[PDB]
């Protein structure tokens, strides 16, 4: 069956959740975002847990480097010509999602231009 | 009828050829009750509805294109099933402002 | 008449919204109608399948027609 | 088959618009049932139920 | 009543005497029920209503034989229920210029 | 009464391109005056020729 | 224009009151409909089970059937 | 700890004074209820939202209340440590009394 | 982040009181956790208004 | 004993001038009701279902 | 109230607080739920209903009576909440 065989040959899908998502690895360093979201969710009582779009690292990375040389992506929620801002639900699986936007918007910049 | 209610049910979920039986056979007795519409054909009432949308919901420059594809649509080819296809974009019609709520921490109640 | 039929067109672009948020409040209604009659189906279909026979009863009589069947193919 | 080609390139301009957020297999079987003959309360309100069940199944 | 209703059912469904055994069913249900109806005992907004329906659908002439006949029936005597027949009457119009829903193999489902 | 009713029913329903027989309007003027509800009435209707339309 | 805007909005706040009131009584129905279900789904189960009968009663039954035979031919 | 449901149970227990176990009927029936479809009326403006409880003030004659209460919105709006107040301000109007 | 949930609790709390309401304070702090894990705002109201109903039926 | 019979009897003629014959047995019933706690609209569905299904089954 | 109920079942269809038990049950049911409203305490605004339902229906002598006998009612000084009675006179109207 054709789709069964593009559903594993190409990568999940983060624009549409119909491929859910490798959001696992094995070291106790790399889950890090599960556990600082957890501690949030322990921590305060108002908590809004985020929801957010699993990479499946290093792709989000290749799309920021089409950017930085071509053309505009949609899993940036780019605005205007003078105005290129991130998308704000993509996170990267072993890092906070504060602490990535941080970087996301200086090359953010780079693509800005 | 059934190869293809049955392929929708596969596909929205986007996974799933016979984990989908519950939400097939849900669809099955869904249309199984007779719904009666309120306003059954007539091209020019169902497109208006559309056009009043369109301004409400601040996207006015979208609903000066979306008559220009209207007319577009039935040059490529005449439609028979229209008012049920623009109905069915129409239900499915959303505002740009505004999210509605979570449905990814609803699933845990 | 002139206000009158401005007023009156006015009313109707109201009127036209308020049709539609009822309109798709029957289409709520009715999917809460039978998803709760589904639910429902599912439980006493199981129910009735428990308390209405054994289970464990059936199971028997066919193990004891597997052993009883098997011993006389050995005759 | 030519025809088939056509509708759907002016037809996904008006779903993307509208929001709807169907991709084009989808689309396309909702075509087919239309033009099979289908009340259209039932359409929408299957396929407004399927969205909301299937986000939770995944989440 | 019920031998009335299972007559309609079963002329108009076509002779099977087991395939018009859901459409009885429901009628004796929905007349089962106990309720004051409303729009009763105003026979006069439905005639009203009919002769615009005539207007909309452009027969002006329509609405000047249905004024004629309906006086005809007064000045008989006949009915000591004219709202009821009337009512029904105006449910089931369809007007020349929508289209009302097909579907066959619908069953398979 | 039902004979001189039912010409004058079935006129209405052939302006408003209607299909409906002879049979249907006499069932329902004896019916109406034993009391019967027109909302139930009507949706007998309604629904009997959905039907007919579903399995033809 | 200004009057205008003036009996535009009285016009709005009566459609207010009524579709506020339309809004309600759909609410009220639905919280209704829910409760109507969840009471005659627990009703329907406890008598389903009172009158299928349990699997400690069926095995009453084969006792009985148990004491008849012992009564009768092993005293 | 926050999850839907315990939340729930919280909420059931306090309120029908009694234990975790003598409201777990009350319980069942609440999820019930949750679990119904339910399609958004807030799809637009935290304002129209405000407007309508300040028309709620007006309406039973308590406009200090409404005085008081446009003051505090825009405290409310400021702490901002709510992302879902369209809602918490509906919730509010649905237990508008006098 | 102590003073931040009090001073939030405690703007929400001056308003209710202003609506009325026989709710305390405590089942309000609930409701915001409540929204704040999603929820559409028909499902939050009914529940609560039902709670209430039982309440007061019950005492 | 005096002084419900005297609200129901008001309560007859206006029953009377609505152009509906409630009972005066009915009316006593219904004041004594109300006055502990049932919400109106329930109590009406009542009156009128029963009052059809003895019409019925005449 | 159970046997308010029981008594107000027995005069309706015909005297016996027994055999009624299936429409009794219904109404039970139909008791403990809520049916929606338009009013909700304002005896004076019901007393408004009842006259605006006589001036429509072309019977406005009655309602010229009707106001004397709520004047009269009102001087007994009888307790068991107006509105809800008169309400559910004027419903079944």
């Excluded at chain 2, 369109?54 to 008559?67: K, M, W």
């Excluded at chain 3, 049709?19 to 429902?40: G, P, S, T, Y």
């Excluded at chain 3, 439980?43 to 597997?66: A, D, F, G, P, T």
């Amino acid at each position: 069956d054709a789709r069964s065989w593009l559903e594993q040959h190409i990568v999940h899908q983060y624009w549409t959740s119909r491929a859910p998502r490798f959001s696992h690895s094995s070291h106790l360093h790399s889950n890090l975002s599960a556990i600082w979201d957890q501690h949030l969710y322990t921590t305060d009582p108002l908590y809004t847990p985020d929801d957010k779009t699993i990479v499946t690292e290093t792709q989000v990375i290749r799309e920021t480097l089409w950017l930085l040389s071509g053309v505009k992506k949609l899993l940036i929620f780019q605005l205007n010509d003078g105005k290129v801002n991130v998308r704000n639900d993509i996170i990267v699986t072993h890092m906070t999602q504060n602490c990535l936007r941080s970087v996301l918007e200086q090359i953010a910049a780079y693509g800005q231009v | 009828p059934n190869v293809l209610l049955q392929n929708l049910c596969c596909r929205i979920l986007g996974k799933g050829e016979a984990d989908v039986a519950q939400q097939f056979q849900y669809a099955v007795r869904v249309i199984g009750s007779n719904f009666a519409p309120t306003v059954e054909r007539d091209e020019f009432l169902v497109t208006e509805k559309i056009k009043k949308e369109f301004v409400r919901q601040r996207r006015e420059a979208d609903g000066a294109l979306f008559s220009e594809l209207h007319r577009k649509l039935q040059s490529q080819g005449v439609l028979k099933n229209r008012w049920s296809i623009l109905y069915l974009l129409l239900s499915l019609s959303e505002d740009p402002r505004k999210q509605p709520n979570k449905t990814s921490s609803f699933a845990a109640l | 008449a002139i206000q009158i039929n401005f007023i009156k067109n006015m009313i109707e672009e109201t009127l036209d919204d308020f049709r539609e948020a009822c309109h798709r409040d029957i289409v709520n209604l009715q999917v809460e109608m039978i998803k709760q009659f589904h639910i429902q189906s599912s439980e006493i279909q199981m129910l009735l399948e428990r308390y209405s026979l054994n289970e464990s009863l059936v199971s028997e009589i066919e193990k004891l027609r597997e052993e009883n069947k098997r011993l006389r193919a050995n005759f | 088959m030519s025809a088939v080609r056509e509708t759907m390139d002016v037809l996904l301009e008006i779903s993307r618009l509208l929001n709807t957020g169907l991709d084009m297999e989808t689309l396309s079987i909702c075509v087919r049932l239309c033009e099979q003959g289908i009340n259209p309360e039932a359409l929408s309100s299957v396929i407004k139920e399927l969205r909301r069940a299937s986000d939770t199944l995944k989440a």
